[PDB]
Structures are given as C-alpha cells and as structure tokens.
Amino acid sequence: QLLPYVKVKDHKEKLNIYKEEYERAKANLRAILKDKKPFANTKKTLENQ
Amino acid sequence: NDNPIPKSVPLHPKSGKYFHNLHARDLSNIYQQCYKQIDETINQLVDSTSP
C-alpha cells in the first residue's frame, strides 16, 4: 500500500552512489579541462623555443 | 610548480635521434692543415732569409 521499502531504499542508495560518482567524475572532468589550457600554453612556449 | 615547465625530462627515441645527431665540431682536419701550414712556413723561412 505504501512505497516498497526494499525498492525505495535500494533506489535511494543507487541514486546516492550514482550522484556521488557523477559529482566526482564531473569534478575530475572540470579539473582536467581547467588543467588542459596550461598544457596548450606550454606547447605554444615550446614551439616558440 | 606554477607554469607547468619541468626542469628536465627522460630521453625519448625521437630525442635520441637528435642526441645522436649532436656532435662536437671536428677541428682535426683544421689542426692538421694549420700544422702543415706552419711547418711549411718554417721550412720556407729556413732558406728565405738572405745568408
């Protein structure tokens, strides 16, 4: 009659783990995207060298 | 640190080609020519001067 407890708990746990994995993946992707530009700058400096 | 420019990097095969290509300029031929020139100049000077 109420929401299935096992299913709701499993869905909440899987949603939480998926959301944390998404958050860490997006944080890592933002960090690598921010870090990529200095590599392009270093490549430009190396081509100048 | 700061700008990502490492002080040094391990050698690469493409870098190895340039390392092998790099060499000291060889002056052995120039030294031999200079020695021959000075020796012949001394030999010429031996009889060049009026007695």
> What approach was used to elucidate this structure?
cryo-EM
Report the alpha-carbon distance of residue A39 to residue B42 in Å, rounded.
63
Q: What is the nearest CA distance from B39 to chain A, expressed in angstroms?
A: 46
Q: What is the DSSP letter of B41?
A: H
Nearest CA in chain A to B3: A38
Asked if A48 and B9 touch (Cβ cutoff 8 Å), the reply is no
Asked if A45 and B5 touch (Cβ cutoff 8 Å), the reply is yes
Alpha helices in chain B (DSSP H): 13-21, 28-48
Q: For residue A38, how many other CB atoms are within 10 A of its CB?
A: 14
CB-based contacts of B5, cutoff 8 Å, min separation 6: A42, A45
Phi, psi of B6 (to 5 degrees): -65, 145
Asked if A42 and B4 touch (Cβ cutoff 8 Å), the reply is yes
Q: How far is C-alpha B29 from the geometric centre of its chain's CA atoms?
A: 10
Asked if A47 and A40 touch (Cβ cutoff 8 Å), the reply is no
